[PDB]
Amino acid sequence: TYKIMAINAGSSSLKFQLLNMPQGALLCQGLIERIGLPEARFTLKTSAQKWQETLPIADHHEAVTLLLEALTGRGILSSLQEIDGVGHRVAHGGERFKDAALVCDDTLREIERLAELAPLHNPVNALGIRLFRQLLPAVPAVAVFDTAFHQTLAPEAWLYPLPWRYYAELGIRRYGFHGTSHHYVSSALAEKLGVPLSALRVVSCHLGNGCSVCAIKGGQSVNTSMGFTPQSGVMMGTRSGDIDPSILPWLVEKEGKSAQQLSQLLNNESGLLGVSGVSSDYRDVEQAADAGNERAALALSLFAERIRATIGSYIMQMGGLDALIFTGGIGENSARARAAICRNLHFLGLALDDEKNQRSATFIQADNALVKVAVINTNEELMIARDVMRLALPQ
Amino acid sequence: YKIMAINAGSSSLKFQLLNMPQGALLQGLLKTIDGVGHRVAHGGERFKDAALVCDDTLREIERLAELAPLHNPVNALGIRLFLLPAVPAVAVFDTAFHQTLAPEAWLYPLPWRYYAELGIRRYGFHGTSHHYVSSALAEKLGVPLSALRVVSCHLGNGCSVCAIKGGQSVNTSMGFTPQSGVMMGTRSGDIDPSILPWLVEKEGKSAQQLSQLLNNESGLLGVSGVSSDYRDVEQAADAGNERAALALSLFAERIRATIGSYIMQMGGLDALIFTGGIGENSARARAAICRNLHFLGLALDDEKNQRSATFIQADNALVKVAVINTNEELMIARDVMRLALP
Numbered sequence: 001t002y003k004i005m006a007i008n009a010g011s012s013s014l015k016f017q018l019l020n021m022p023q024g025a026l027l028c029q030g031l032i033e034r035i036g037l038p039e040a041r042f043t044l045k046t047s048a049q050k051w052q053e054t055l056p057i058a059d060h061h062e063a064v065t066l067l068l069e070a071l072t073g074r075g076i077l078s079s080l081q082e083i084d085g086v087g088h089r090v091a092h093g094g095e096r097f098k099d100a101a102l103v104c105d106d107t108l109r110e111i112e113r114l115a116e117l118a119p120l121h122n123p124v125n126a127l128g129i130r131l132f133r134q135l136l137p138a139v140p141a142v143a144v145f146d147t148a149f150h151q152t153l154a155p156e157a158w159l160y161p162l163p164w165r166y167y168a169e170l171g172i173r174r175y176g177f178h179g180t181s182h183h184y185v186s187s188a189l190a191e192k193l194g195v196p197l198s199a200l201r202v203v204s205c206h207l208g209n210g211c212s213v214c215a216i217k218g219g220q221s222v223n224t225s226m227g228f229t230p231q232s233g234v235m236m237g238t239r240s241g242d243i244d245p246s247i248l249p250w251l252v253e254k255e256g257k258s259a260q261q262l263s264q265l266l267n268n269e270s271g272l273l274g275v276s277g278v279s280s281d282y283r284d285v286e287q288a289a290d291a292g293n294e295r296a297a298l299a300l301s302l303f304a305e306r307i308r309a310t311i312g313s314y315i316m317q318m319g320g321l322d323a324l325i326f327t328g329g330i331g332e333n334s335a336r337a338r339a340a341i342c343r344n345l346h347f348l349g350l351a352l353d354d355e356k357n358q359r360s361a362t363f364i365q366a367d368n369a370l371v372k373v374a375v376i377n378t379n380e381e382l383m384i385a386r387d388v389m390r391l392a393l394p395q
Numbered sequence: 396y397k398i399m400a401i402n403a404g405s406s407s408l409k410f411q412l413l414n415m416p417q418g419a420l421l422q423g424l425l426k427t428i429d430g431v432g433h434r435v436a437h438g439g440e441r442f443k444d445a446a447l448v449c450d451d452t453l454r455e456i457e458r459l460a461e462l463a464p465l466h467n468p469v470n471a472l473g474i475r476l477f478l479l480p481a482v483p484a485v486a487v488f489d490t491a492f493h494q495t496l497a498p499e500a501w502l503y504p505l506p507w508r509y510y511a512e513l514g515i516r517r518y519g520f521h522g523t524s525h526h527y528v529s530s531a532l533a534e535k536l537g538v539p540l541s542a543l544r545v546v547s548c549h550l551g552n553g554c555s556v557c558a559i560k561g562g563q564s565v566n567t568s569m570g571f572t573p574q575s576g577v578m579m580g581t582r583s584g585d586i587d588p589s590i591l592p593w594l595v596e597k598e599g600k601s602a603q604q605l606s607q608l609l610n611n612e613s614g615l616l617g618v619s620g621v622s623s624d625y626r627d628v629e630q631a632a633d634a635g636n637e638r639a640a641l642a643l644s645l646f647a648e649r650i651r652a653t654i655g656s657y658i659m660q661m662g663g664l665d666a667l668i669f670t671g672g673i674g675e676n677s678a679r680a681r682a683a684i685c686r687n688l689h690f691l692g693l694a695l696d697d698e699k700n701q702r703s704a705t706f707i708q709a710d711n712a713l714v715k716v717a718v719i720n721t722n723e724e725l726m727i728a729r730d731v732m733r734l735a736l737p
């Protein structure tokens with residue numbers, strides 16, 4: 001067995017998991033949040049216990065220090081030498097990274113170069129990589145990019161119909177995200193079916209606060225709904241997803257919106273929150289909808305419709321469908337959302353078993369359906385730990 | 396009867412006089428009067444159908460210039476000129492056919508007030524074309540249009556797709572303005588909306604420049620670097636221009652993605668219609684759009700497609716695939732007949 005730590009560094013946060021590999025058992029997990037802010041908090045959980053303290057945490061360096069000291073201070077590790085590898089979530093690998101990469105000087109420059117494409121995430125992702133290299137110098141580290149799984153998209157799927165120089169000189173194209181989650185659940189589906197992923201045409205729906213759909217054919221991503229940034233594609237908690245682009249110049253002219261306000265509009269004020277007027281949380285919107293709030297009911301119906309439209313585009317592209325996967329916090333738990341998304345799909349041989357769907361069984365398709373419909377819990381940290389093993393510990 | 400179809404472009408004036416009912420032509424800005432029909436670009440939510448031209452109609456139109464400020468004004472001007480005070484007139488709106496869309500199809504996932512206070516929503520256009528060719532299809536097949544699940548592709552310099560189920564438009568690809576949906580001659584269609592704030596920040600684009608980018612510099616012209624005209628791009632791709640070949644592949648991909656959404660929404664497909672300058676004449680575009688669709692029972696017959704036959708699906712195919720020449724002036728004249736000489 002090996003001890004692999006999965007790290008996700010945010011602008012003011014540090015998420016971590018420590019896993020026993022290859023079995024994937026969780027030794028501990030937690031979150032340091034409001035780094036640099038007042039009310040900074042360090043949470044740490046094992047299977048048996050939870051510890052939580054509000055205390056000043058100036059920067060990510062202090063966050064990493066407190067984490068490493070707690071690993072031994074709580075008897076989780078006898079020593080930091082027990083750590084065999086670290087996997088780092090990186091938001092954007094551009095076209096440079098088609099797979100996870102061993103951390104090294106060139107990897108770090110590339111990730112910082114790509115800050116131009118993810119300004120709020122890639123720099124702190126790299127800071128985390130640097131802090132662990134500094135504080136755990138002897139532990140190999142692997143960068144795992146949320147974009148890499150989608151680097152197999154063909155040009156007619158990633159080119160936008162803008163003038164060519166917007167791609168050629170400015171890098172504007174569809175990248176796609178949730179790559180680690182779509183890779184994880186699609187591989188898990190094939191393992192559960194006992195067939196190679198390459199034999200299946202798969203549509204994968206990651207439905208959480210962020211939401212994305214991915215088409216997987218021949219074992220490779222061939223399309224996915226987020227585009228240039230994680231703002232686009234289907235409707236989400238606060239993100240609009242795709243809208244008529246000509247709305248934005250209209251709003252700049254009418255309301256004088258700045259670029260920053262336009263992004264805030266598209267990313268923080270839209271989606272379930274903007275339509276329902278209630279909440280970004282699917283459960284909250286559903287609760288209001290069942291009590292008669294018509295905007296909330298419309299929010300939920302539009303949410304399912306946008307996902308259905310995207311599934312339909314990708315079934316068309318692949319020439320049919322063998323399996324549909326639901327994952328994420330909504331896809332895993334909402335029998336009602338899955339039922340609305342899957343309704344009236346007899347032209348595909350796709351129908352649900354209501355009893356299986358109601359209990360979120362692993363497979364929820366009807367007895368005589370031609371399409372497998374799976375509810376699979378996504379585990380991005382396990383996926384990252386597997387990439388660490390593959391690239392840092394081939395032995 | 397003699398019906399006059401009028402299209403008042405902001406510096407032009409297309410005209411057609413037809414022998415109704417059978418629609419024989421008597422063409423204009425001249426080739427070889429019971430009522431006049433006026434093309435109107437935007438009917439908002441107010442007009443679900445063509446309307447008799449009266450005072451009420453005319454200032455409802457001129458109010459909607461708040462949404463179509465560069466077209467509705469001189470459309471209503473052309474109406475007011477017709478100076479022809481004894482001839483009944485009817486306004487035919489490019490948006491009206493799509494007023495049967497349900498909220499799930501026309502509401503954007505924006506803050507609610509953008510719809511509720513500013514009227515921002517999907518309207519859709521090419522309504523008279525989609526209405527015309529879908530009705531003609533049902534007539535050719537000899538069944539009610541309400542019996543068919545139809546996807547209609549109007550492919551010309553402007554391009555749009557429309558899903559028709561139960562005899563009504565249930566979705567269409569152009570949105571708030573005619574800029575959006577699929578890739579076109581110079582219009583980009585739908586793109587990742589987050590690109591635009593990025594461009595404002597990185598290149599200092601004004602709203603005007605963003606509009607010019609989306610409407611005049613993108614599409615076939617922007618991708619190919621050759622032309623906004625499909626045939627010109629095709630010539631260059633045939634000669635080895637890689638961008639031109641990519642432009643044509645992306646053009647078909649965008650239409651296919653949209654067709655797939657609409658098939659999903661309708662729960663299947665009975666017929667696909669191609670119309671417009673590209674749809675009526677390009678065997679290549681139709682074949683690339685219809686590739687590898689056996690899961691729907693849709694395949695093309697190469698000999699029929701090559702000569703643009705009225706029906707081009709393979710004889711073993713379940714889905715009818717039709718090539719129908721659109722005739723919006725005839726459609727307008729039929730609207731005049733129905734509302735002004737009933």
Ligand SMILES: Nc1ncnc2c1ncn2[C@@H]1O[C@H](COP(=O)(O)O)[C@@H](O)[C@H]1O
Nearest residue numbers: 207208209281282283328329330333334
């Ligand atoms: N039991 C549940 N039923 C429906 N939605 C849920 C449930 N639990 C969490 N969610 C939703 O999952 C989303 C976030 O999940 P994630 O970001 O994938 O962890 C939020 O919109 C939540 O409302």
